[PDB]
Structure of Muzzle protein gp44:
Amino acid sequence: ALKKEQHFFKGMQRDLSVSKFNPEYAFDAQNIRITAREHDTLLSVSNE
Amino acid sequence: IAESPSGLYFIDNETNSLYLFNGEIVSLSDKLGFRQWISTHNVHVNWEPVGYNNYRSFYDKNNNDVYFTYKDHCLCYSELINQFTSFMSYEGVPAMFNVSSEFYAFKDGKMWEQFAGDYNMFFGEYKPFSITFVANAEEPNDKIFNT
Amino acid sequence: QRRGLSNILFNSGLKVSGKRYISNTIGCANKWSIAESPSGLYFIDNETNSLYLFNGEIVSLSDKLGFRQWISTHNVHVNWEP
Amino acid sequence: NSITVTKEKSLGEDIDTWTNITLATTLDLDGDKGEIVSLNTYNNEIFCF
Amino acid sequence: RIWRANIPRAIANNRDRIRNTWAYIKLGMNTPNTYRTEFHDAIIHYFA
Amino acid sequence: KGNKEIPLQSPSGDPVVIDGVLLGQNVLNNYVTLFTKGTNDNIYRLENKGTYFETLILFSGNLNFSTDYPIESISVYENNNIQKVYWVDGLNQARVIN
């Protein structure tokens, strides 16, 4: 196509206008863990 | 109110904020953008085990996770990164506590050892996981979202 | 302590004054993981799954340098014995 | 708005000081903020909500 | 999904465009209504 | 977002009309105490129920009150029965009300 955009997940953020949201955060997440637990999955979304 | 090495996490219903006292009061909800979520979920009624009405804050000593449980959701805050992680499927659980070097929870008259069963199986039931993220790149421009 | 770390105020007139807690929730449970050094006190807390360093303020070296998983997967309740 | 304080536990061959409440060392907070919702300790200091 | 409004022209002539080094731009609702109107941002196109 | 009127119903349920100009308020814990002037010099106690204010008229007389001297108050909660509201004008003596 024409353009792209990369999204990382440093945390979960809310309360911010959709026009001005930050791609580094997730708007809403259910049963995930972003810290490395039982495996080296830090800064990578992983299960509960 | 949940004690931790980092401070005292308490939720004030009067001011609609999730504070953290560590010598100075810091509003975590304002800092991390959760004013609306707490402002829309506050109630005057005090917490009691039969019906969750206000929040019930626990603390996972083994992993530095703070769970602000509610009657229909469980907002998890991680002190390792100082960020809210997810909306956990641990709602309506009366107790969540550490015994020695393991984290435990008590629901429906039984003790459930946490972080020990099969993935995506909470209290014997399968709960889904998801992640939502706004896609607004060059937001003045109108875009066709494709892949 | 097993879930505490205090500073025993002594000779700060040689009388043993009261104590002073540095952390009410963090404390070493295995005595033999404690190593003294000029930089501080390196101890491993099995309760919290971290490798701390006390130099006036408790700093989690495992979290700082990314070793949470390695210690969380290698902890045990049993005390050290030769 | 009132906090009673017991004696320091002797940890010697006598009674448990905590069970013996005499109300001889009370402390009253301001009544125009509200009732004492919670008492907590953090790093060698008591904090009252 | 983007609004675009032609900037008014001077009341004195009704022909001259708003030509100046700067200008005050004021959007508003003055008709009775009960809506929540999120207003994210506004781009102004000029000719320099 | 706009405002929503809250009816001032008495404990019997009848409407309670407030006399006139308000000089000051005071929220103790959940009781709002109004010091209003008008034809008389009134004091009210408003408790927010689910959808209405349970209004009581604690006094209706001639406590000399002026609009040029509004009210400033401090209110303490000692117990269920001793709930006081100390208030002062710039003109009259300091007063108390349970």
